[PDB]
Amino acid sequence: ATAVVRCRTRLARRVVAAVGPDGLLPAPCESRVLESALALALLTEERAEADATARLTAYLRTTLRTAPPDPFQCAVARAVLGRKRLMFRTVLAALGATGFPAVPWEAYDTQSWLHMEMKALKVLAAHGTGHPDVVRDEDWRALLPALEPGPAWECNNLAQLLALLALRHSPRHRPALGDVLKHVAGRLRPDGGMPAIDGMTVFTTAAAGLALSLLPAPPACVTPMADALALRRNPDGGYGFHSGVAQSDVEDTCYVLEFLRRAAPDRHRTAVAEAEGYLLALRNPDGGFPTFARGTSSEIAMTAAAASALAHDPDRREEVDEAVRYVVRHQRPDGTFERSWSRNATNAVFRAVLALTGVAAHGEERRSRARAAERALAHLAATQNGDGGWGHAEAEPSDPISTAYAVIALARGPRARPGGPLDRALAYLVERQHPDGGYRSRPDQAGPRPLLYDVPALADVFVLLALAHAT
Ligand SMILES: CC(C)=CCC/C(C)=C\CC/C(C)=C\COP(=O)(O)OP(=O)(O)O
Ligand SMILES: [Mg+2]
Ligand SMILES: [Mg+2]
């Protein structure tokens, strides 16, 4: 057929091959400078795990020299080798690089993940400013999961590392420190670094399952993939980003729900209904959806994702319509929406356009939604790079993941024409395919925002999702 279909075919073979017999696509996270630096600081202060601290030191020096991250992580690394503003400043102050914020202690009180990180930073600031008496027993109590053996609580190495840097100041918690330092030291990757998270296999398996389910003839492996996801659902009916993550989130749950609706709607009928229930219980009064917890602010990409995921059930048409109306209201004067968990402009455009064009609509609302979708697709056309791709921002060089999101959106516009934006984007993706069938991309996932972390398995998965939508 076409060079695009040949590309799609080679990539689908690669993704299918990567799925294991347990139904999961492995999705390890690369080493990250922030967690590596905090681990070095911790092990160094405790005079522990000499072999690991030397590997961490060499990892940080190499990375700073060859592939330096953002300026904040660079400053963290240099400090150890030699609300977000509150958190990041307090991290640097704990490492001796700047002064502690002169804020009331209540400034630190607040994710269950963010809550633990901010309590740990509160303790570090109390001790660092010479006021250890300020720390209350409820502050220490929040940190107790960091003393449990095994992988980090919620697969979150930042939260455990900060908690342990705080807890090593408390005499009544130190008996438990030795054992957990051994398992922290045991997490180093082959390059000597500490990954941000244990992995992202639930998110990655769900997105890949969805992409495979959009192919003309989905592979047999979608069934064990669907099985592997459904048996990992949390009690509230939602999904976390990796095995062992108790805090469900809207983004993971929408990808799982979208996948199960296509590949296993009867086999996994109860998980499907529980995932819809999870989303509906989170819905905010304004018709939007938060990321984790009701009462926190609606977000555009989460609202669009939930609109599309719920649209399958005609019984939910009223909540879907209110979510799409929310998307229309929040479009910016230049046709864009607003980032978040992705650091590129194209992620929220792709979610918004799918919501604006999937939910069938007629009359005035059809015209309102069509105008919004056109402005967003026009923003993509206006910002497309000369090589046919998109970057993280309008003046950034193209990358396959940012381009994949734009392709998914453009596949909802008018048909590709020779030399048009969608045609040129697909040619860009065809040209970036590696001999082994895969894609390498700058990562787009952030957390804590805006700090990037790198799960390389996602590049293949999102490019396949784009090619499955566009063909
Ligand atoms: C599934 C995925 C694509 C959605 C992104 C959110 C997801 C559930 C994981 C984020 C990664 C996290 C473990 C690192 C800290 O992020 P953080 O949540 O603490 O970041 P924040 O402080 O800015 O809120
Ligand atoms: Mg956080
Ligand atoms: Mg975190």
Q: What is the DSSP string of 271-321?
A: HHHHHHHHHHHH--TTS-B-SSSBTBPPBHHHHHHHHHHHTTSGGGHHHHH
Q: Whose CA is nearest to atom 6 of ligand 1?
A: 341
From 162, 254, 341, 451, the mutation candidate for ligand 1 (largest count of ligand atoms within 8 A of CB) is: 341
Q: Are 388 and 428 in contact (CB under 8 A)?
A: yes
The two three-digit tokens of residue 440, written as one number: 């390498």
Identify the nearest ligand to the CA of 453 by its number. 1
Q: Whose CA is nearest to atom 14 of ligand 1?
A: 447
Q: Whose CA is nearest to atom 15 of ligand 1?
A: 447
* Closest CA relative to residue 88, chosen from 43, 39, 47, 125: 125
- In order of their start, the domains of the chain are 3-28+201-470 (1.50.10.20), 33-185 (no CATH)
Side-chain half-sphere CA neighbours of 225 within 13 A? 34
SS3 194: coil
- The CA-atom distances, in angstroms, between 380 and each of 331, 405, 408 are 14, 10, 11
Q: Are 346 and 310 in contact (CB under 8 A)?
A: no
Data resolution in angstroms: 1.8
* Alpha-carbon span 82 to 384, nearest angstrom: 43
Ligand 1 atom index nearest CA of 200: 1
What distance in angstroms lies between residue 338's CA and the mean position of ligand 3's atoms?
Answer: 21
* Alpha-carbon span 87 to 448, nearest angstrom: 10
Ligand 1 atom index nearest CA of 87: 22
From 70, 83, 114, the mutation candidate for ligand 1 (largest count of ligand atoms within 8 A of CB) is: 114
Q: Which residues contact 4 (CB under 8 A, 6 or more apart)?
A: 426, 429, 430, 467, 470, 471
Q: Give the type of residue at 420.
A: G
Pocket of ligand 1 from Cβ distances under 6 Å: 111, 113-114, 156, 196-197, 203, 241, 249, 251-252, 341, 445, 447-449
Burial class (CB in 10 A: 0-12, 13-18, 19+), 358: middle
Q: Are 209 and 247 in contact (CB under 8 A)?
A: no
* Closest CA relative to residue 44, chosen from 181, 159, 183, 186: 181
